[PDB]
Design a protein around this ligand. Sequence first.
Ligand SMILES: O=C(O)C[C@@H](SC/C=N/O)C(=O)O
Ligand SMILES: O=C(O)C[C@@H](SC/C=N\O)C(=O)O
Ligand SMILES: [Fe+2]
Ligand SMILES: [Fe+2]
Lengths: 327, 326
Amino acid sequence: NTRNFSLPQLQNLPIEEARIVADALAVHATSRQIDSAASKLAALAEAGLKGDRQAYAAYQQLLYVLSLSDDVATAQTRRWLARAIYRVEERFMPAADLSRALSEEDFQKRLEQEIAAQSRERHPMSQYVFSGSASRAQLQVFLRHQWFRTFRLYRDAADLLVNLTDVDEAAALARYLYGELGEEDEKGSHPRLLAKLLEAIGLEADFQAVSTMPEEIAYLNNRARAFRHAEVGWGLAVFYITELVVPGNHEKLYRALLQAGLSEDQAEYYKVHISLVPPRAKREWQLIARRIPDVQFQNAFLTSLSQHFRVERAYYDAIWEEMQSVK
Amino acid sequence: NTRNFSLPQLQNLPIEEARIVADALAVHATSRQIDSAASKLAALAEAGLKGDRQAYAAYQQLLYVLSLSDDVATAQTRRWLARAIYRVEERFMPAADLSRALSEEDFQKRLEQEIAAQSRERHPMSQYVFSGSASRAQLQVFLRHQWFRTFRLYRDAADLLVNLTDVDEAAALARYLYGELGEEDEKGSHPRLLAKLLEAIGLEADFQAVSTMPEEIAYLNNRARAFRHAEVGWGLAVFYITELVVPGNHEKLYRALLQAGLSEDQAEYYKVHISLVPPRAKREWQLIARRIPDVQFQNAFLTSLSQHFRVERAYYDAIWEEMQSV
Ligand SMILES: O=C(O)C[C@@H](SC/C=N/O)C(=O)O
Ligand SMILES: O=C(O)C[C@@H](SC/C=N\O)C(=O)O
Ligand SMILES: [Fe+2]
Ligand SMILES: [Fe+2]
């Protein structure tokens, strides 16, 4: 009942700094113990981002524990420590580095060119699933990782809701959350729809799941960082590229799963997005349109979009390799 | 630098700790500056809660700035500093020390008993307003403070949503937020419904409103602390006490405003809770029912409830005093 709490995970990490983090998470942890943990985490991230593969794996695994564990008692300090890593990560990410604001037209055009160039729908694995050709074992690989992307997405969206101080924009994210959590029926929440689909093909849907795929950990860490960022451009970038790409991708995945012999009801997870999302996306765009004139927003948004695509592509690459290792 | 950002509010507080907090909220503030702010805030709260009236008012004003300002860039550090104060505050609150969990029936009975003993609806001001004897200006006093209670309640609910790790419990709070923010029409969010009522009776509904009433600040500080607490018994206590009391209170406030010459549409803010809340309260009860076997939950819940009633009563008393002066 605690496999995804912070302390059990930290005691299982053959990383020295895991003990310093654990001490920082104690109920009566001192300011010096917490700041010490912050210092070791920041140094570990700096070493990893400079090319040290062992330091890279260490800082990522610790950041996964800090940002996505489920013991709320340590969450505030965990997020405080996560911030020390985020500051390094962001100070290492290629910045959009506009000196002045792009036109709204050039902003949408640049947005459109990047989405066209790097969307998950064009990935060879995606066309492969669409192709029909995937074995059952290979669809299990795909859906096993779909679970990690879907099952706590609503929490990342809630972090963005919390940071939208304007009541009408919070209302927009609330409408998103309501839809995502099943409207009036929590049995129809989108994680539980995906769980039903997973159950139909022989897989478990574990609400305490802890990933051991490095590229997947990298993807979830980045998404939580972006949705929690104080400059909501980071979260709006990730939110909007998802809400924009989901319908076409889910339409083709839906068709592929019925072609794999599952029913309309089992694949409901994909079906509902095809119809639920497009109109709400049109309303959600105003939160972005409102901010276009601000170059600080443009730089946060475009930097976040580019980083999200880099980690998504490496994640999809690793899933594709795993898929092809089975038959 | 808007009126409800942290730095403009801090510059207006003639307190030395206000400058230390200001330095701690700077973009390149060091860990030493933040720990200094945290220490001096904790010491200020300790001095105020032991009986230093000026330190009491001072830490309460500072906590209002930390917990409820709207400059998101400092939000994470402000909440870190608020926690240093919360830790002190919770050591002074009378804590429920039950060693064994009440039965579900005994627990519900205790809640009902505490509500019948402490509900805001029994306050002399409430009865007086219900009587139809309130002046237009007196109703204005009432609604000015209604604004402060209503306009950001959804954010506190959202903090509880974030701390409910169970997908089904997050969903229950999401349904609450959806209802609270107007469902498909943000023009009908409940803050905007209250704004429509305030404007119908000559008042401005300011989404950057900053309270200057000490008891109102104490109320809002406590409610945000409770909804943000890592042990969700605190927030579930305040959430559930509010959801339980709102329907009957709002029906009578609605009738009283209609008696005073307000339209059905103008007073919609109070009307919509009469029918929206009773259905939602029955589904929200399962969040409490599932945790009743846990005595730590019961103690957190009951301590929250008693503290909430304490700050709410002092707040209604202060509104009542203002209403009598007009
Ligand atoms: O990749 C992501 O982060 C988004 C997920 S889920 C979209 C909505 N799910 O309820 C996906 O794989 O489509
Ligand atoms: O006491 C409070 O803080 C609650 C508000 S109403 C909230 C309505 N629906 O959630 C009031 O002042 O009546
Ligand atoms: Fe969804
Ligand atoms: Fe409401």
